[PDB]
Amino acid sequence: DPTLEWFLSHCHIHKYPSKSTLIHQGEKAETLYYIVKGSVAVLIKDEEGKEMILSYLNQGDFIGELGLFEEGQERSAWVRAKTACEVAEISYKKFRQLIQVNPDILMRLSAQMARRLQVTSEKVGNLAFLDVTGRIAQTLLNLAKQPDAMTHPDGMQIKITRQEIGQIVGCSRETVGRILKMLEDQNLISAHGKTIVVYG
Amino acid sequence: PTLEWFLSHCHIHKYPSKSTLIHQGEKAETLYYIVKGSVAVLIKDEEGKEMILSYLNQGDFIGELGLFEEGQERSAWVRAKTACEVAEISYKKFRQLIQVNPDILMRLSAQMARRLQVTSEKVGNLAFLDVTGRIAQTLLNLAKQPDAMTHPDGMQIKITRQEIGQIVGCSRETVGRILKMLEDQNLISAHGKTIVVYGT
Ligand SMILES: Nc1ncnc2c1ncn2[C@@H]1O[C@@H]2COP(=O)(O)O[C@H]2[C@H]1O
Ligand SMILES: Nc1ncnc2c1ncn2[C@@H]1O[C@@H]2COP(=O)(O)O[C@H]2[C@H]1O
Ligand SMILES: Nc1ncnc2c1ncn2[C@@H]1O[C@@H]2COP(=O)(O)O[C@H]2[C@H]1O
């Protein structure tokens, strides 16, 4: 996009190494981010430090938007780099000037906000309506369709730890192990540690 | 002013109480704005049980999620709680108003942001809390809303056990049992016609 190139001209770009934290929950929000390269996880936590992953976000995604529309808000979640990342940043105040000049850039942001609300509402449904087995089976399916899934004789090979699965579906590493064993017994997957083949 | 200008481009209509304004799966081509009344946003499981994702009220946009990409479906049901007066405008015409004054899109997007914050908090509650914890957090959330009333013992709220159940994802009977327990632990009063949540 000329429109994205223009926007990015007004930003300053910074590099975050894998596993660094871009955004901490509770911080005062005054800036917008945009992922030029790399991927992140958006995380929230329990009273006990238990993590739940709300979303992954990737190249092309805005981050830090939820504070833009009313002053004095706090970041709603943690954002942690899943890989090395390159991230453009701009102040809300400069971004609002860009909006005035060309509201197409707010349309692009708002389109992502709408999709997130859809996807997060679908997550609420999954958590409310599906048992942990159904959530795990749905998670493996979705991971198998991701761009990073390797093709396999029997289906798609994915790379994900039980910990990560637990953080997505909302259960312990141990509950994940018990259910993965069930799914292999049922001849639906194979599991070799962090490697899982989902059968087509 | 801005609002007054926007409503002049809309058609306004009345929906009686209990009438469904938006059905999940319908083609999304139009945006709505609540001039008067209150609605619930609902999803359904495979057994017809409804969960309430949100209550929305006068000044809220509804049906916004399809605005940014063509050929989408309505993501949820939206049902009138009270009778509603609702302004409606095509997505095409709204996209024209945005070029006049993108504050109208800022207002809509502020609401999407809030909704994503609320719905993300719901994801955590379902992941991290048991049904009692979820009910307790729901009472706390209701106590914080502007329509709660100050009470000598805390905040007084107005909500049926059926509504709580649809918010939390449990039966009305389960709610009634758990409220009696919470009252017994001296956290709420619920034996009256409303609920008072202590220390609120
Ligand atoms: N449910 C969600 N889906 C996708 N991204 C989210 C979600 N919740 C929060 N975030 C992102 O996490 C960021 C945390 O900081 P902000 O609240 O400023 O902006 C937030 C969003 O960019
Ligand atoms: N309800 C839950 N019970 C246990 N772990 C949870 C829950 N929700 C999210 N999690 C997270 O998922 C993680 C899976 O790996 P761990 O068991 O090490 O730690 C777990 C928590 O951080
Ligand atoms: N989690 C949510 N919170 C508040 N409103 C929502 C939520 N999910 C869906 N909606 C509203 O429900 C409407 C359903 O139709 P749309 O998807 O067009 O637009 C949607 C929003 O206005």
CATH number at residue B151: 1.10.10.10
In degrees, to the nearest 5, what angle opens at C-alpha B96 toward C-alphas B94 and B97? 65
Q: How many angstroms is it from B68 CA to the middle of ligand 3?
A: 14
By what technique were these coordinates determined?
A: X-ray
DSSP string, A127-140: HHHS-HHHHHHHHH
Q: Which two tokens stand for residue B6?
A: 């926007």
CATH number at residue B15: 2.60.120.10
| Residues B184 and B196 reside in one and the same domain | yes
Going from the C-alpha of A188 to that of each of A129, A167, A183, A197, the distances in angstroms are: 22, 22, 5, 9
Q: How many angstroms is it from B10 CA to the middle of ligand 1?
A: 32
Tell me which residue range forms the domain holding B175: 130-200
Q: How many angstroms is it from B66 CA to the middle of ligand 3?
A: 9
Order of all β-strands in the sheet with B39-44: B20-22, B77-80, B39-44, B50-56
Q: Which two tokens stand for residue A51?
A: 């993590």
DSSP string, A139-186: HHHHHHTSTTPEEETTEEEEE--HHHHHHHHT--HHHHHHHHHHHHHT
The C-alpha atoms of residue B28 and residue B78 are separated, in whole angstroms, by: 13
Kindly identify which residue of chain A lies nearest to residue B167, measuring between CA atoms. A128
Strand-pairing partners, residue A155, are: A152, A199
A159: helix, strand or coil: strand
| Residues B115 and B140 reside in one and the same domain | no
| Residues B6 and B103 reside in one and the same domain | yes
Q: Which two tokens stand for residue B42?
A: 């609902």
| Residues A92 and A65 reside in one and the same domain | yes
User: B6, exposed or middle or buried, with CB in 10 Å at 0-12, 13-18, 19+?
Assistant: buried
Instruction: Pinpoint the alpha helices (H) of A83-161.
Output: 92-101, 104-129, 132-144
Where are the strands (E) in chain B, listed by range? 11-15, 20-22, 30-36, 39-44, 50-56, 61-62, 77-80, 84-90, 149-151, 154-157, 188-189, 195-198
| Residues A61 and A121 reside in one and the same domain | yes
With beta carbons less than 8 A apart as the criterion, state whether A56 and A41 touch: yes
Determine the residue type at B11. H
| Residues A73 and A124 reside in one and the same domain | yes
A26: helix, strand or coil: coil
| Residues A126 and A74 reside in one and the same domain | yes
Looking at B95, B129, B163, which one is the last position of a domain?
B129
Looking at B113, B129, B145, which one is the last position of a domain?
B129
Q: Per the structure, how many domains does chain A have?
A: 2
The C-alpha atoms of residue A103 and residue B101 are separated, in whole angstroms, by: 9
| Residues B175 and B187 reside in one and the same domain | yes
| Residues A110 and A159 reside in one and the same domain | no
| Residues A121 and A42 reside in one and the same domain | yes
| Residues B113 and B158 reside in one and the same domain | no
The C-alpha atoms of residue A145 and residue A132 are separated, in whole angstroms, by: 20
Closest residue by Cα to residue A81 from A36, A119, A130, A46: A36
- Tokens 């390797």, residue? A150
Which of A53, A110, A135, A171 to mutate to test binding with chain B, by most B CBs within 10 Å of its CB? A110
The C-alpha atoms of residue A118 and residue A140 are separated, in whole angstroms, by: 20
**Residue among A46, A54, A117 whose CB faces B65 most closely:** A117
Ligand 1 pocket member A166 (CB < 6 A): no
Looking at B129, B147, B178, which one is the last position of a domain?
B129
| Residues A42 and A107 reside in one and the same domain | yes
Strand A195-199 relative to strand B77-80: parallel, antiparallel, unpaired? unpaired
Is residue A166 a known part of a binding site? yes
**Binary contact (A106, B110; C-beta < 8 A):** no
With beta carbons less than 8 A apart as the criterion, state whether A99 and B106 touch: yes
Resolution (angstroms) equals: 1.5
